[PDB]
Structure formats: C-alpha cells, structure tokens
Amino acid sequence: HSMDPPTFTFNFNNEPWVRGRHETYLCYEVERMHNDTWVKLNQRRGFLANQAPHKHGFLEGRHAELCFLDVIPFWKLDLDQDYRVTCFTSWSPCFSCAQEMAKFISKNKHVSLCIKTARIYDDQGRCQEGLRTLAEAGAKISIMTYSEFKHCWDTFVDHQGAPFQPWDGLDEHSQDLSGRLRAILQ
Amino acid sequence: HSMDPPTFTFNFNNEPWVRGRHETYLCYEVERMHNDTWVKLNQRRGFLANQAPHKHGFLEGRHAELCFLDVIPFWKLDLDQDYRVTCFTSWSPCFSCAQEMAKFISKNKHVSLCIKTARIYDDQGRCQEGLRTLAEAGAKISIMTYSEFKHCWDTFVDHQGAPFQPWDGLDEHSQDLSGRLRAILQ
Ligand SMILES: [Cl-]
Ligand SMILES: [Cl-]
Ligand SMILES: [Mg+2]
Ligand SMILES: [Mg+2]
Ligand SMILES: [Zn+2]
Ligand SMILES: [Zn+2]
Ligand SMILES: [Zn+2]
Ligand SMILES: [Zn+2]
C-alpha cells in the first residue's frame, strides 16, 4: 500500500557519504496518451523492493526491477495504446536487470519507460554498459531532484498529512549525479 | 552588500494572492566552459533591481532586465569562449524586455542564458509572446523551486547563517507556475 516514512527517508536519501542502503525500493505509476497529453491511470501505482533470498540458498533474492517486470503483464495494458511507465528507484539497476528491462521494452513497444533514480549504482564492472544498453533500447533515465522526491513522498509514503522534509545537500547531490549520468550515457 | 533578508522574502515569495511586489529583483551568476564543464566565475555575480522613474517624468523607470543587459558588456567576456549566464528573477520579463533579451542573445552567441523566475508576469497582452520569442532565441526559461530559492538565499542574501525557511505554499505555487509555463511555451 503506502511506504513507512522512515523507510522512505533512509532509502531515498541521496547523500554520498553514508552506507547501509542495501535495498532497492521502486515506486511506479502509469500514464496513457490521449490527444497529445499523458493522462494518469488512477489505480496503476504502487511500490516494491528487492526480495530476500529463499532459505534453500544458491539463488540471490529477486531484485526489485525483476519484480516490477513481473507485475506489468497483470495490468492488462492495451497493446494499441501508448503508455508511459515511470519508476522512481532508490538505486539504478544492476547490469542483469538493465538487460532484462531493455529486453522487455524492446518487445513491448506500447510502453515508454522512464527511470528516475535517487542514486547511481556503479559497480565499476558492467553497470555502465547496462545503463547504456537500457537507454539505447529507449528508456529515459534521469536523476531525481527535489520535485521528484517531494512527489514520491506525497504519492507513495504513508505521510499522514505531514509534508516532505528535504535533507541537507539534496540539490547539490542531484546535480553531481546528473553530471555523472551524462558521462555514463555519452 | 548582499541582499537584505526581508527584501528577499518579500520579493521572491511566490504566493499569487498578495500584491505590492512592484519591483523586479534579478540575481545573476556566470560560468565559463572549461574542457566540457561549466565552471563558476564567482567574481561575476551579483544582483540588481528595476530603477525608479526620473523626476522629469514621461519615461518609466528602467527595468531590471535592461540594467542587466547594460552591465554584460562591462564583464569583458571573451567572444571566442562560451558562457552560461543564469538569472534568478522575481518576475518574468515584460514583452519589451523579453524582445530586447532575445535580440541580445541572438547577437551574442558566446552567451547561453538561463532565466529562473519566482513568478510569471502575464499582463494578458504580449507577455506570453515575449516568453515564446525569448525561448525561441535560445533562452532556457524555468520556474524557481525550493532548490533555487534556497540557492539564492544561501548565495545572495545576508542571512547571518540562518537557513532558508520556505514560506507557506512554496512547492504548490511552484508546481502550478511550472504547469502554466509549460502551457505558455508549448
Ligand atoms: Cl549505501
Ligand atoms: Cl504583486
Ligand atoms: Mg553531502
Ligand atoms: Mg498559496
Ligand atoms: Zn526458491
Ligand atoms: Zn538487478
Ligand atoms: Zn531621465
Ligand atoms: Zn521590462
């Protein structure tokens, strides 16, 4: 349903000099194109996170991005309509998730994917390749700014009427990250 | 001297339902491109306001935007280099100022202009045309959000170490204005 406020603050914080944000949270919403305008679909919104590994071991816990792809077919989107699916993510995807997402959007031309991320995850391995591959397949990847954090608080958090409280350095971090993303995607 | 805090708050407040904000304040900053990166030239920053009419009458007081254009030649920018000049304005320009600013940027290709405005001034005459013409000439026009107000407070105001305290409604007014600006520029 709605995210717990402390969970939001801990996970969407874009501060560079802290650690421990090991989870990925993903909030999604959907619009449909009508008369050159994106119209929000009321019911098609939610959030999810990565899953814990199963007790049997061997396999990693299912990543948030794969869960996201799992749910989309259940929305019964009309293949003749055009949709914009926006994901607000606390981290950008790992390589294998990026590859899967790229495959999905290549096969589902009715979906325009936008990924707005709090933080870039760059393992200095294949993460950059993944992001480039995902953008090549048509995804629009960007860094969350104040307005997107506030939107996510208002739309996905169990705020009980309380307003979004920005943290110190929010815009400076977003700007640094936007520059880093430009360098990855160039 | 830096800007007086009450002067900033009075003039940059984005509530539409008060009156009396007859001045326009304009805060400016300049960056120079150095090896693919914008670098601030912090000596080239400042703020100004519109002028009172002369006692001889007939002519309106000189608008802030024209004063801004007046000073740019005195910065001795290098015509062979590239600069980004950002203005944070309390009101967007009137038609005749927008026209003059469009002419200036058309003749000064070393300058990329960004105008970030607290409020839209729409006289229901030629103001919208002015904004469209200024955008067409290459200016990037946008509405100030929390982050830009905070930046201006921290950078241009004699704050005495006090943090920026947003006024009621800041984000909702900014969002409304961003919608209005989209409709104007489309
Ligand atoms: Cl972390
Ligand atoms: Cl006013
Ligand atoms: Mg920091
Ligand atoms: Mg209000
Ligand atoms: Zn299992
Ligand atoms: Zn993954
Ligand atoms: Zn005179
Ligand atoms: Zn004017």
Contacts of residue B144, Cβ cutoff 8 Å, sequence gap at least 6? B12, B14, B88, B116, B117, B118, B152, B174
Q: Using alpha carbons only, what angle is made at residue B43 by residues B31 and B156, rounded to the nearest 5 degrees?
A: 90
Nearest to A61 by CA among A8, A97, A113: A97
Percent of residues in chain B assigned helix, strand, coil, to nearest 5: 40, 20, 40
Which residue(s) pair with B141 in the sheet? B115
Nearest to A134 by CA among A98, A96, A108, A168: A98
Mutate to test the interface with A, among B144, B171, B172 (most CBs of A within 10 A): B171
Closest chain B C-alpha to A146 CA, distance in angstroms: 7
Alpha-carbon span A155 to A173, nearest angstrom: 23
Alpha-carbon span A11 to A6, nearest angstrom: 8
Alpha-carbon span B86 to B63, nearest angstrom: 17
Q: Which two tokens stand for residue A65?
A: 């991005």
Give, as one character, the DSSP assignment of residue B44.
G
Nearest CB to A150 within list B150, B151, B171: B171
Ion ligand 8, residue ranges at CB < 5 A? B 63, 94, 97
Determine phi and psi for B175, rounding to 5 degrees. Answer: -65, -45
What residue type is assigned to position A93 of the chain? P
For this PDB entry, the determination method is X-ray
Closest chain B C-alpha to A169 CA, distance in angstroms: 10
- Is A65 considered catalytic here? yes
Percent of residues in chain A assigned helix, strand, coil, to nearest 5: 40, 25, 40
Nearest to A109 by CA among A74, A138, A72, A73: A138
Mutate to test the interface with A, among B29, B114, B146 (most CBs of A within 10 A): B146
Nearest to B101 by CA among B24, B1, B176, B186: B24
Alpha-carbon span B123 to B129, nearest angstrom: 11
| Structural domain boundaries in chain A | 1-186
Contact B26, B85 (CB under 8 A): no
Ion ligand 3, residue ranges at CB < 5 A? A 169
Nearest CB to A145 within list B147, B150, B171: B147
Q: Which two tokens stand for residue A160?
A: 């009980």
Q: Exposed, middle or buried by CB within 10 Å (0-12, 13-18, 19+), for A23?
A: middle
- Resolution, given in Å to one decimal, reads 1.4
